[PDB]
Amino acid sequence: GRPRWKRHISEQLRRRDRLQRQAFEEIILQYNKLLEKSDL
């Protein structure tokens, strides 16, 4: 039984990663791959 404020931080932290990291993680990868090619 984790306290309310602890669960709140775990939920908010996962929400932070959903809205910020997980959103751009794949496109940034695909972009940098295309960039490196252009420099070739």
Binding site: W5, S10, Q12, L13, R16, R21, E25, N32
Partner: protein, 266 residues
């Protein structure tokens, strides 16, 4: 609560690096998109950015790179997550940082000549933290090899390598209910002072633990009434035990960086 440490350690911020428009280049410079570690520093993780934009410029125009957001030079000695939470959190992603090779703002920035200058500033923040908690007994009682593993863990983004040593910095004597003092910094965009740092104990006279609101009610009473209290990009409940925050939600420098920003316009 090891899951919270990883979530805090591995947080990433999508960022867009665009070259300043007045810089003269031999060819077109495409923007460089990158995920920045929230817990690291700009000068540390930007090596790929520096090499990318330095290829398109003449050596005559090359100088010490510095970064800026909406006309504000970004202080590299502040953690990346803090700079974003404090400045760009209300705007649309990705974080838009402009790359400047010219006209260095001597007044608002520290020169970062090498990686050592970052390690020097970083270790200073740790020593200052352990002085407030253990009276520098834990950090001074470590071999110099352990101090390098903390830095190497941050530099190489190794969660286990870093927290192997850093766990000893989060422990306190049994008789005591927490640290001697909680290292923290409260940043606000409209205040003349860079931040608010004072002496605050995790425990009250009666023995009850101080919460995040108790701290704010003390050193920043004007932020509670309209304002957001943001730590690592989230909005913790004010009842959160402060001792717990210092352990789990601190940055690798063992400081708790708190940002007070108004509610986003829309």
């Amino acid at each position: 609560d090891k899951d919270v440490l990883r979530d805090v350690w591995f947080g990433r911020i999508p960022t867009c690096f665009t070259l300043y428009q007045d810089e003269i280049t031999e060819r077109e410079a495409e923007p460089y998109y990158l995920l920045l570690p929230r817990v690291s520093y700009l000068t540390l993780v930007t090596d790929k950015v520096k090499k990318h934009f330095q290829k398109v410029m003449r050596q005559e125009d090359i100088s010490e790179i510095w970064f800026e957001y909406e006309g504000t030079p970004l202080k590299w000695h502040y953690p990346i997550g803090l700079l974003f939470d404090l400045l760009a959190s209300s705007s649309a992603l990705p974080w838009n940082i402009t790359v400047h090779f010219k006209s260095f703002p001597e007044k608002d920035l520290l020169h970062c000549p090498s990686k050592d200058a970052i390690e020097a500033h970083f270790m200073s923040c740790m020593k200052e933290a352990d002085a407030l908690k253990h009276k520098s007994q834990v950090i001074n009682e470590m071999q110099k090899k352990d101090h390098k593993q903390l830095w190497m863990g941050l530099q190489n983004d190794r969660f286990d390598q870093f927290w192997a040593i850093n766990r000893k910095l989060m422990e306190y004597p049994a008789e005591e209910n927490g640290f001697r003092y909680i290292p923290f910094r409260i940043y606000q965009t409209t205040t003349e002072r860079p931040f608010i740092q004072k002496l605050f104990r995790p425990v009250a006279a009666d023995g009850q633990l101080h919460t995040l609101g108790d701290l704010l009610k003390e050193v920043c009473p004007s932020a509670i009434d309209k304002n957001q209290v943001m730590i690592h990009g989230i909005e913790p409940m004010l009842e959160t035990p402060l001792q717990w925050l210092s352990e789990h939600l601190s940055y690798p420098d063992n400081f708790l960086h708190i940002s007070i920003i108004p509610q986003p316009t829309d």
